[PDB]
Amino acid sequence: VRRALIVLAHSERTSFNYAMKEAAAAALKKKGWEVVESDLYAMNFNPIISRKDITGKLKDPANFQYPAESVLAYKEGHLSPDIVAEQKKLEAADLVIFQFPLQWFGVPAILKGWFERVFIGEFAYTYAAMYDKGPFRSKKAVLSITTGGSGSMYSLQGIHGDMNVILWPIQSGILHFCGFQVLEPQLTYSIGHTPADARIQILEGWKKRLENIWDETPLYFAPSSLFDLNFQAGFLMKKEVQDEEKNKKFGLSVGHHLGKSIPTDNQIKARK
Numbered sequence: 001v002r003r004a005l006i007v008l009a010h011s012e013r014t015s016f017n018y019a020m021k022e023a024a025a026a027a028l029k030k031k032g033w034e035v036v037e038s039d040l041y042a043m044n045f046n047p048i049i050s051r052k053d054i055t056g057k058l059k060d061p062a063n064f065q066y067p068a069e070s071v072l073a074y075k076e077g078h079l080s081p082d083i084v085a086e087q088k089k090l091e092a093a094d095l096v097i098f099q100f101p102l103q104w105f106g107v108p109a110i111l112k113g114w115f116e117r118v119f120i121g122e123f124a125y126t127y128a129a130m131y132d133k134g135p136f137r138s139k140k141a142v143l144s145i146t147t148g149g150s151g152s153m154y155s156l157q158g159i160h161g162d163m164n165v166i167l168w169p170i171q172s173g174i175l176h177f178c179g180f181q182v183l184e185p186q187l188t189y190s191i192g193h194t195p196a197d198a199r200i201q202i203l204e205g206w207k208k209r210l211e212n213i214w215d216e217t218p219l220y221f222a223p224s225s226l227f228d229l230n231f232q233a234g235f236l237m238k239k240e241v242q243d244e245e246k247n248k249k250f251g252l253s254v255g256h257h258l259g260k261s262i263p264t265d266n267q268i269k270a271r272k
């Protein structure tokens with residue numbers, strides 16, 4: 001605790017995203033938090049992964065493979081200076097806040113490129129310690145999102161569909177895959193159609209929550225202990241666990257629906 005990192009993915013300083021970023025920093029600071037920032041647009045961050053990310057000789061210049069090359073570079077300390085700087089922030093951060101506007105049912109290209117360049121093997125993950133057993137297992141991450149469409153549009157009967165499915169690839173595949181303890185996402189719908197007074201309360205509510213996030217309960221994800229970790233098995237659910245689940249109405253999570261009903265708001269509300 002005491003050390004937070006806020007990754008913002010918005011170009012304008014007159015936007016609500018910037019407003020939400022400034023509100024978070026203030027609240028955390030008022031509580032004695034060390035707030036470090038990562039304003040991707042202000043830093044003119046480079047989102048494209050390339051051989052340039054490796055500041056040295058490549059093991060196989062003829063057949064360049066980023067995964068392999070980036071890992072070796074990390075091991076020998078030959079990573080681009082801008083990548084190493086972001087990694088240093090993460091290592092020291094206890095809480096990581098991601099502030100960004102929903103873009104094409106996903107994360108902005110500049111933020112996506114941030115994950116792709118900063119989350120290097122051996123540093124942010126390992127196929128020998130996946131998910132709950134990952135390197136960031138002692139950290140907590142929260143997604144603060146803003147949207148143009150209303151909440152009803154992202155409801156089970158909304159034209160766009162369940163928001164839980166949209167959040168799944170990010171909160172699970174990216175954040176939790178690295179070990180992160182994902183907390184409930186702060187969702188702000190149709191911010192472009194909300195009255196001023198209401199916008200003030202949203203910021204006040206955001207600050208209020210940040211006063212006790214560290215004490216919040218994280219979302220539920222199927223523990224890695226329920227799977228056979230090794231290819232001889234295929235990283236599949238343990239036979240014992242499979243049988244014991246046949247007599248259940250709901251699945252484990254959005255991705256592990258197992259063909260049954262998906263636990264409502266599994267990626268939006270905590271507890272099981």
Ligand SMILES: Cc1cc2nc3c(=O)[nH]c(=O)nc-3n(C[C@H](O)[C@H](O)[C@H](O)COP(=O)(O)OP(=O)(O)OC[C@H]3O[C@@H](n4cnc5c(N)ncnc54)[C@H](O)[C@@H]3O)c2cc1C
Nearest residue numbers: 014015016017019101102103104105146147148149191199
């Ligand atoms: C390429 C692209 C793809 C998109 N894809 C999607 C999608 O898939 N799904 C979806 O739902 N939406 C999508 N959107 C819409 C996007 O999510 C919204 O435009 C964005 O979230 C609006 O928030 P904002 O941070 O830009 O703020 P703004 O546009 O500024 O709006 C915030 C409002 O609050 C006012 N304001 C600013 N600061 C403060 C403050 N401190 N206090 C009070 N009021 C304040 C602003 O003047 C404004 O009226 C997309 C947009 C783009 C460009």
